[PDB]
Design a protein around this ligand. Structure first.
Ligand SMILES: O=C(O)c1cc(SCCc2ccccc2)ccc1NS(=O)(=O)N1CCN(c2ccccc2)CC1
Ligand SMILES: O=C(O)c1cc(SCCc2ccccc2)ccc1NS(=O)(=O)N1CCN(c2ccccc2)CC1
Ligand SMILES: O=C(O)c1cc(SCCc2ccccc2)ccc1NS(=O)(=O)N1CCN(c2ccccc2)CC1
Length: 143
């Protein structure tokens, strides 16, 4: 799936940049990162309170914590209205969790976190993402 692999590249790179501050390792994939850096950073500033609250409540300190959350996150994310704000909040929350993982570690484990965020996104929103012209539709929505 091109939608799954494209989503994994964009979500993994943003979470890696956010956790470190660089970061260290098809124009739409590139233009989606620049939009996500701009809108994603804004969501992390405007909703830090709710992000700190969810993070404290979920705890999330290891890969086993990352795995069990995804199984709950798939179910609750498939419920209710879908829009780009909701999708960027999911990714923004992923970046917020990743910054916390680097804070209590040395780096990892943010790669299984990015896979779990992508799996939540593509498994629950694939039809809507298709109807919205995928990651290209994302760039236009926040031009
Ligand atoms: O999004 C934020 O970060 C958020 C922050 C505050 S804190 C008071 C802010 C305020 C503003 C102006 C003047 C006085 C107080 C209050 C609401 C905020 N969001 S939500 O958009 O209204 N929202 C989303 C987060 N919600 C949540 C639900 C369950 C578990 C944890 C969080 C609560 C509902
Ligand atoms: O389903 C509706 O219409 C809905 C409307 C409002 S207002 C609030 C919630 C509603 N649904 S939700 O199923 O409870 N839901 C959908 C919206 N979600 C969201 C989360 C982050 C960023 C933007 C949106 C929150 C979870
Ligand atoms: O998009 C929604 O459907 C959405 C709904 C709520 S209501 C859950 C409040 C809560 C309470 C305790 C601990 C964590 C979260 C809050 C945030 C929402 N989105 S998100 O910010 O994009 N996000 C992150 C939190 N997610 C989560 C839900 C249940 C267990 C574990 C994680 C849902 C996806």
């Amino acid at each position: 799936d091109e939608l799954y692999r494209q989503s994994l590249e964009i979500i993994s790179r943003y979470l890696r940049e956010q956790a470190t501050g660089a970061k260290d390792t098809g124009a739409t994939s590139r233009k989606a990162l620049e939009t996500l850096r701009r809108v994603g950073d804004g969501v992390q500033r405007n909703h830090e309170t709710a992000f700190q609250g969810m993070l404290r409540k979920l705890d999330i300190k290891n890969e086993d914590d990352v795995k069990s959350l995804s199984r709950v996150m798939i179910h609750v994310f498939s419920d209710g209205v879908t829009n780009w704000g909701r999708i960027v909040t999911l990714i923004s929350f992923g970046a917020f969790v990743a910054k916390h993982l680097k804070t209590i570690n040395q780096e990892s484990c943010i790669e299984p976190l990015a896979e779990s965020i992508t799996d939540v996104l593509v498994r629950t929103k694939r039809d809507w993402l298709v109807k919205q012209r995928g990651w290209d539709g994302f760039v236009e929505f926040f031009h």
